[PDB]
Amino acid sequence: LPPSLPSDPRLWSREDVLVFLRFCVREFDLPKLDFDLFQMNGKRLCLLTRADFGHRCPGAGDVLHNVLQMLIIESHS
Amino acid sequence: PLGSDGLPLDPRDWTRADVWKWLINMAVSEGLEVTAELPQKFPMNGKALCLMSLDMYLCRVPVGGKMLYRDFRVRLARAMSR
């Protein structure tokens, strides 16, 4: 994804978090996301449980969560 | 490049629209009720489906979800043969 975003999502700013989500909505062809539900930095985004994501993005929250978790694993691997 | 069914041969090129058409075809093929709610459980494209584990399919469709997973994997497998 955008090279501007730091490798470790846990270090993302609030705006980095929004870029990631907008990129995901396009990349996965997701329905309009309610960004009011995601006004948070990377630290907190990464703490959302799968169910948390599910509530904020019904239908694809689990996919988004897994992608995010994978990006974290990756920031290390 | 589309297959017999109107769907692109490579599942990774599937838009959400393609995913929905594939779901409707699977319902018809498997003799499952064709409902508007089935596709609503999958508001995503093929790229997203590639990331879905069997567990995520069953969660959405407990009755028949494994056939969806199985069918998508078969399509993806032959596609990767590029």
PDB file of C-alpha atoms in Angstrom:
ATOM      1  CA  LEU A   1       0.000   0.000   0.000  1.00  0.00           C
ATOM      2  CA  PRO A   2       1.034   3.696   0.137  1.00  0.00           C
ATOM      3  CA  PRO A   3       4.804   3.953   0.851  1.00  0.00           C
ATOM      4  CA  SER A   4       4.109   7.020   2.988  1.00  0.00           C
ATOM      5  CA  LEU A   5       2.594   4.841   5.725  1.00  0.00           C
ATOM      6  CA  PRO A   6       5.080   3.510   8.287  1.00  0.00           C
ATOM      7  CA  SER A   7       5.637  -0.261   8.225  1.00  0.00           C
ATOM      8  CA  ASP A   8       4.386  -0.854  11.763  1.00  0.00           C
ATOM      9  CA  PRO A   9       0.649   0.043  11.874  1.00  0.00           C
ATOM     10  CA  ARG A  10       0.925   0.518  15.635  1.00  0.00           C
ATOM     11  CA  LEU A  11       2.817   3.724  14.840  1.00  0.00           C
ATOM     12  CA  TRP A  12       0.193   5.148  12.472  1.00  0.00           C
ATOM     13  CA  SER A  13      -1.191   8.632  13.029  1.00  0.00           C
ATOM     14  CA  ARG A  14      -4.957   9.201  12.787  1.00  0.00           C
ATOM     15  CA  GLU A  15      -4.589  10.333   9.186  1.00  0.00           C
ATOM     16  CA  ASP A  16      -2.422   7.287   8.395  1.00  0.00           C
ATOM     17  CA  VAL A  17      -5.277   5.162   9.729  1.00  0.00           C
ATOM     18  CA  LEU A  18      -7.759   6.869   7.406  1.00  0.00           C
ATOM     19  CA  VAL A  19      -5.501   6.430   4.360  1.00  0.00           C
ATOM     20  CA  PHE A  20      -5.241   2.721   5.147  1.00  0.00           C
ATOM     21  CA  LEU A  21      -9.010   2.345   5.427  1.00  0.00           C
ATOM     22  CA  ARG A  22      -9.729   4.322   2.224  1.00  0.00           C
ATOM     23  CA  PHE A  23      -7.122   2.233   0.417  1.00  0.00           C
ATOM     24  CA  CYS A  24      -8.809  -0.928   1.779  1.00  0.00           C
ATOM     25  CA  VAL A  25     -12.294   0.167   0.718  1.00  0.00           C
ATOM     26  CA  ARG A  26     -10.992   0.598  -2.844  1.00  0.00           C
ATOM     27  CA  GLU A  27      -8.704  -2.459  -2.908  1.00  0.00           C
ATOM     28  CA  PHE A  28     -11.383  -4.810  -1.627  1.00  0.00           C
ATOM     29  CA  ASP A  29     -14.383  -3.056  -3.226  1.00  0.00           C
ATOM     30  CA  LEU A  30     -16.053  -2.576   0.168  1.00  0.00           C
ATOM     31  CA  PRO A  31     -19.240  -0.564   0.692  1.00  0.00           C
ATOM     32  CA  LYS A  32     -18.988   3.029   1.941  1.00  0.00           C
ATOM     33  CA  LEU A  33     -17.239   2.994   5.311  1.00  0.00           C
ATOM     34  CA  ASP A  34     -18.389   5.234   8.189  1.00  0.00           C
ATOM     35  CA  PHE A  35     -15.104   6.968   8.983  1.00  0.00           C
ATOM     36  CA  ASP A  36     -16.583   8.603  12.093  1.00  0.00           C
ATOM     37  CA  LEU A  37     -16.158   5.150  13.654  1.00  0.00           C
ATOM     38  CA  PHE A  38     -12.422   5.109  12.891  1.00  0.00           C
ATOM     39  CA  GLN A  39     -11.119   8.423  14.238  1.00  0.00           C
ATOM     40  CA  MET A  40      -8.170   6.925  16.101  1.00  0.00           C
ATOM     41  CA  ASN A  41      -4.413   6.425  15.810  1.00  0.00           C
ATOM     42  CA  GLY A  42      -2.658   3.216  14.797  1.00  0.00           C
ATOM     43  CA  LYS A  43      -2.096   2.133  18.394  1.00  0.00           C
ATOM     44  CA  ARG A  44      -5.822   1.897  19.075  1.00  0.00           C
ATOM     45  CA  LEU A  45      -6.795   0.631  15.615  1.00  0.00           C
ATOM     46  CA  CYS A  46      -4.498  -2.320  16.243  1.00  0.00           C
ATOM     47  CA  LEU A  47      -6.221  -3.066  19.555  1.00  0.00           C
ATOM     48  CA  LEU A  48      -9.682  -3.470  18.037  1.00  0.00           C
ATOM     49  CA  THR A  49     -10.921  -7.044  18.374  1.00  0.00           C
ATOM     50  CA  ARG A  50     -12.363  -8.867  15.390  1.00  0.00           C
ATOM     51  CA  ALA A  51     -15.829  -8.224  16.838  1.00  0.00           C
ATOM     52  CA  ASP A  52     -15.010  -4.516  17.184  1.00  0.00           C
ATOM     53  CA  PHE A  53     -14.196  -4.331  13.481  1.00  0.00           C
ATOM     54  CA  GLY A  54     -17.282  -6.372  12.739  1.00  0.00           C
ATOM     55  CA  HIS A  55     -19.480  -3.766  14.397  1.00  0.00           C
ATOM     56  CA  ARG A  56     -17.804  -0.854  12.563  1.00  0.00           C
ATOM     57  CA  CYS A  57     -17.778  -2.629   9.192  1.00  0.00           C
ATOM     58  CA  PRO A  58     -20.545  -5.241   8.961  1.00  0.00           C
ATOM     59  CA  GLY A  59     -19.844  -7.756   6.228  1.00  0.00           C
ATOM     60  CA  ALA A  60     -16.085  -7.174   5.959  1.00  0.00           C
ATOM     61  CA  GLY A  61     -14.787  -6.198   9.394  1.00  0.00           C
ATOM     62  CA  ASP A  62     -13.098  -9.561   9.890  1.00  0.00           C
ATOM     63  CA  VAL A  63     -11.201  -9.231   6.610  1.00  0.00           C
ATOM     64  CA  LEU A  64      -9.955  -5.737   7.535  1.00  0.00           C
ATOM     65  CA  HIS A  65      -8.937  -6.959  10.977  1.00  0.00           C
ATOM     66  CA  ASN A  66      -6.977  -9.863   9.544  1.00  0.00           C
ATOM     67  CA  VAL A  67      -5.245  -7.649   7.005  1.00  0.00           C
ATOM     68  CA  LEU A  68      -4.215  -5.251   9.760  1.00  0.00           C
ATOM     69  CA  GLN A  69      -2.989  -8.082  12.010  1.00  0.00           C
ATOM     70  CA  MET A  70      -0.985  -9.396   9.044  1.00  0.00           C
ATOM     71  CA  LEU A  71       0.633  -6.005   8.450  1.00  0.00           C
ATOM     72  CA  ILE A  72       1.818  -6.051  12.065  1.00  0.00           C
ATOM     73  CA  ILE A  73       3.221  -9.585  11.803  1.00  0.00           C
ATOM     74  CA  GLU A  74       4.914  -8.353   8.630  1.00  0.00           C
ATOM     75  CA  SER A  75       6.421  -5.222  10.171  1.00  0.00           C
ATOM     76  CA  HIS A  76       8.574  -7.758  12.032  1.00  0.00           C
ATOM     77  CA  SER A  77       8.951 -10.766   9.715  1.00  0.00           C
TER      78      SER A  77
ATOM     79  CA  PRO B   1     -10.848 -12.876 -20.139  1.00  0.00           C
ATOM     80  CA  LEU B   2     -14.144 -14.360 -18.944  1.00  0.00           C
ATOM     81  CA  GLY B   3     -15.202 -17.953 -18.420  1.00  0.00           C
ATOM     82  CA  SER B   4     -18.299 -19.690 -19.747  1.00  0.00           C
ATOM     83  CA  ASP B   5     -20.267 -18.081 -16.895  1.00  0.00           C
ATOM     84  CA  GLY B   6     -19.607 -14.377 -17.452  1.00  0.00           C
ATOM     85  CA  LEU B   7     -17.054 -14.460 -14.650  1.00  0.00           C
ATOM     86  CA  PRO B   8     -13.377 -13.625 -15.197  1.00  0.00           C
ATOM     87  CA  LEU B   9     -11.225 -16.767 -15.272  1.00  0.00           C
ATOM     88  CA  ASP B  10      -8.889 -15.315 -12.627  1.00  0.00           C
ATOM     89  CA  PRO B  11     -10.835 -14.905  -9.314  1.00  0.00           C
ATOM     90  CA  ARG B  12      -8.318 -12.226  -8.309  1.00  0.00           C
ATOM     91  CA  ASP B  13      -9.777  -9.997 -11.014  1.00  0.00           C
ATOM     92  CA  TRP B  14     -13.288 -10.321  -9.555  1.00  0.00           C
ATOM     93  CA  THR B  15     -15.062  -7.121  -8.511  1.00  0.00           C
ATOM     94  CA  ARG B  16     -17.778  -7.211  -5.851  1.00  0.00           C
ATOM     95  CA  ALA B  17     -20.311  -7.524  -8.679  1.00  0.00           C
ATOM     96  CA  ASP B  18     -18.554 -10.679  -9.932  1.00  0.00           C
ATOM     97  CA  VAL B  19     -18.434 -12.113  -6.406  1.00  0.00           C
ATOM     98  CA  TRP B  20     -22.215 -11.650  -6.112  1.00  0.00           C
ATOM     99  CA  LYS B  21     -22.914 -13.260  -9.482  1.00  0.00           C
ATOM    100  CA  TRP B  22     -20.692 -16.210  -8.467  1.00  0.00           C
ATOM    101  CA  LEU B  23     -22.624 -16.533  -5.195  1.00  0.00           C
ATOM    102  CA  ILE B  24     -25.961 -16.559  -7.020  1.00  0.00           C
ATOM    103  CA  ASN B  25     -24.634 -19.224  -9.437  1.00  0.00           C
ATOM    104  CA  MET B  26     -23.377 -21.315  -6.511  1.00  0.00           C
ATOM    105  CA  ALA B  27     -26.775 -21.101  -4.805  1.00  0.00           C
ATOM    106  CA  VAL B  28     -28.507 -22.278  -7.998  1.00  0.00           C
ATOM    107  CA  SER B  29     -25.928 -25.031  -8.578  1.00  0.00           C
ATOM    108  CA  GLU B  30     -26.127 -26.301  -4.986  1.00  0.00           C
ATOM    109  CA  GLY B  31     -29.896 -26.076  -4.750  1.00  0.00           C
ATOM    110  CA  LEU B  32     -29.872 -23.392  -2.072  1.00  0.00           C
ATOM    111  CA  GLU B  33     -32.548 -20.714  -1.849  1.00  0.00           C
ATOM    112  CA  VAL B  34     -31.503 -17.721  -3.987  1.00  0.00           C
ATOM    113  CA  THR B  35     -31.757 -14.816  -1.541  1.00  0.00           C
ATOM    114  CA  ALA B  36     -30.767 -11.146  -1.467  1.00  0.00           C
ATOM    115  CA  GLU B  37     -29.144 -11.687   1.939  1.00  0.00           C
ATOM    116  CA  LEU B  38     -26.568 -14.214   0.717  1.00  0.00           C
ATOM    117  CA  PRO B  39     -24.577 -11.663  -1.319  1.00  0.00           C
ATOM    118  CA  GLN B  40     -25.016  -9.046   1.400  1.00  0.00           C
ATOM    119  CA  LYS B  41     -22.847 -11.297   3.603  1.00  0.00           C
ATOM    120  CA  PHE B  42     -20.045 -10.769   1.074  1.00  0.00           C
ATOM    121  CA  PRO B  43     -19.760  -7.040   0.267  1.00  0.00           C
ATOM    122  CA  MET B  44     -16.233  -7.445  -1.180  1.00  0.00           C
ATOM    123  CA  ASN B  45     -14.254  -8.405  -4.314  1.00  0.00           C
ATOM    124  CA  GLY B  46     -12.116 -11.398  -5.278  1.00  0.00           C
ATOM    125  CA  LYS B  47      -8.951  -9.995  -3.664  1.00  0.00           C
ATOM    126  CA  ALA B  48     -10.785 -10.007  -0.337  1.00  0.00           C
ATOM    127  CA  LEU B  49     -12.076 -13.548  -0.893  1.00  0.00           C
ATOM    128  CA  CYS B  50      -8.490 -14.789  -1.342  1.00  0.00           C
ATOM    129  CA  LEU B  51      -7.842 -13.681   2.232  1.00  0.00           C
ATOM    130  CA  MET B  52     -10.903 -15.506   3.612  1.00  0.00           C
ATOM    131  CA  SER B  53     -10.343 -18.692   5.593  1.00  0.00           C
ATOM    132  CA  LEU B  54     -12.928 -21.499   5.527  1.00  0.00           C
ATOM    133  CA  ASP B  55     -13.911 -20.297   8.987  1.00  0.00           C
ATOM    134  CA  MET B  56     -14.961 -16.913   7.616  1.00  0.00           C
ATOM    135  CA  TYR B  57     -17.139 -18.534   4.946  1.00  0.00           C
ATOM    136  CA  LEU B  58     -18.896 -20.837   7.426  1.00  0.00           C
ATOM    137  CA  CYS B  59     -19.485 -17.876   9.718  1.00  0.00           C
ATOM    138  CA  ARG B  60     -21.486 -16.182   6.975  1.00  0.00           C
ATOM    139  CA  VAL B  61     -23.032 -19.312   5.458  1.00  0.00           C
ATOM    140  CA  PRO B  62     -23.058 -22.213   7.980  1.00  0.00           C
ATOM    141  CA  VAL B  63     -25.170 -24.280   5.589  1.00  0.00           C
ATOM    142  CA  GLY B  64     -23.174 -24.519   2.357  1.00  0.00           C
ATOM    143  CA  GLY B  65     -20.273 -22.251   3.237  1.00  0.00           C
ATOM    144  CA  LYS B  66     -17.686 -24.987   2.665  1.00  0.00           C
ATOM    145  CA  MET B  67     -18.762 -25.490  -0.948  1.00  0.00           C
ATOM    146  CA  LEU B  68     -18.218 -21.766  -1.553  1.00  0.00           C
ATOM    147  CA  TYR B  69     -14.734 -21.963  -0.032  1.00  0.00           C
ATOM    148  CA  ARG B  70     -13.938 -25.113  -1.974  1.00  0.00           C
ATOM    149  CA  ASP B  71     -15.166 -23.707  -5.302  1.00  0.00           C
ATOM    150  CA  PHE B  72     -13.266 -20.424  -4.916  1.00  0.00           C
ATOM    151  CA  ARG B  73     -10.021 -22.267  -4.097  1.00  0.00           C
ATOM    152  CA  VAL B  74     -10.365 -24.440  -7.204  1.00  0.00           C
ATOM    153  CA  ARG B  75     -10.846 -21.364  -9.384  1.00  0.00           C
ATOM    154  CA  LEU B  76      -7.896 -19.615  -7.748  1.00  0.00           C
ATOM    155  CA  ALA B  77      -5.664 -22.693  -8.007  1.00  0.00           C
ATOM    156  CA  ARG B  78      -6.082 -23.129 -11.759  1.00  0.00           C
ATOM    157  CA  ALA B  79      -5.648 -19.376 -12.201  1.00  0.00           C
ATOM    158  CA  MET B  80      -2.291 -19.281 -10.412  1.00  0.00           C
ATOM    159  CA  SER B  81      -1.137 -21.698 -13.118  1.00  0.00           C
ATOM    160  CA  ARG B  82       0.116 -18.569 -15.101  1.00  0.00           C
TER     161      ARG B  82
END
